[PDB]
């Protein structure tokens, strides 16, 4: 993706304060609560019946961490999101059968989570830079679908 110098620095600076473990679990949990149909990919994770159940589920927290850690890796390769995610793109298509629309929903929930966690520091321009990134990542992950 194409970020201006100001946008790249916005993204980098904020990400240095993110505890991936914690934000990942929050982001995945909120995806499952806010858009419950997404629970279709996690039948084996246990109790997902209520917000509290979802949010405290250790398997949700574990997966959340996995996902955001891979996400973090892309932050290191903003110039080549496609090449970076090619293997996972094929995995999500061919083995997991995940509709790429889910990548877009997670991107939006992640933005909500950063705003919730960071408050006033997540200003309009910072949000804008993160929206570009999240769209970039979702496009990178949907790229090998066929």
């Amino acid at each position: 993706v194409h970020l201006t110098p100001e946008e790249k620095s916005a993204v980098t600076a904020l990400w240095g304060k993110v505890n991936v473990d914690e934000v990942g679990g929050e982001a995945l949990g909120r995806l499952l609560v806010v858009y419950p149909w997404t629970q279709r990919f996690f039948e084996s994770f246990g109790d997902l019946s209520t917000p509290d159940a979802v949010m405290g589920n250790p398997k949700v927290k574990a997966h959340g961490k996995k996902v955001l850690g891979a996400f973090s890796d892309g932050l290191a390769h903003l110039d080549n999101l496609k090449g970076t995610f090619a293997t996972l793109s094929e995995l999500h298509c061919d083995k997991l059968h995940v509709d790429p629309e889910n990548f877009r929903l997670l991107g939006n929930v992640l933005v909500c989570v950063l705003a919730h966690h960071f408050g006033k520091e997540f200003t309009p321009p910072v949000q804008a830079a993160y929206q570009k990134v999240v769209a970039g990542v979702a496009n990178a992950l949907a790229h090998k679908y066929h």
Binding site: P36, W37, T38, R40, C93, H97, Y145
Partner: protein, 142 residues
């Protein structure tokens, strides 16, 4: 969005013409969707999606029958499609975006098969009708 009385007239006329081909049209619309919008294939990994497969033809028929049911009960779609709205919301869990893609492919299919009846006003009414069906099918999602 709500179907006007003229819309209901338009839909019933066009659908009436579909008649006995509803199931074959349902099948073609699905094949058009799978080829045009490959991400929709993620919901059918358990099907043989080869052209003319019995799975696709049977599914195509079930889709068309549900559409016929909705036309017959256009005045009360929510009740008519209740069971289907529960199935999609609780079991299938198809992202709502995909409803727009199938609707587009059904419109294309009807266009290719109803030269005489696919006027601008009918096209408008059918588009609204498919949007309403989609709305009812996703209404219990959350």
């Amino acid at each position: 969005m709500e179907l006007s009385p003229a819309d209901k007239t338009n839909v019933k006329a066009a659908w009436g013409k579909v008649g006995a081909h509803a199931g074959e049209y349902g099948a073609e619309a699905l094949e058009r969707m799978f080829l045009s919008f490959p991400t929709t294939k993620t919901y059918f990994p358990h099907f043989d999606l080869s052209h003319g497969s019995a799975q696709v033809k049977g599914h195509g028929k079930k889709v068309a029958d549900a559409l016929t049911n909705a036309v017959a009960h256009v005045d009360d779609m929510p009740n008519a499609l209740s069971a289907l709205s529960d199935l999609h919301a609780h079991k299938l869990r198809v992202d709502p975006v995909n409803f727009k893609l199938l609707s587009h492919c059904l419109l294309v299919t009807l266009a290719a098969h109803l030269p005489a009846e696919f006027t601008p006003a009918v096209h408008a009414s059918l588009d609204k009708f498919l949007a309403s069906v989609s709305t009812v099918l996703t209404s219990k999602y959350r």
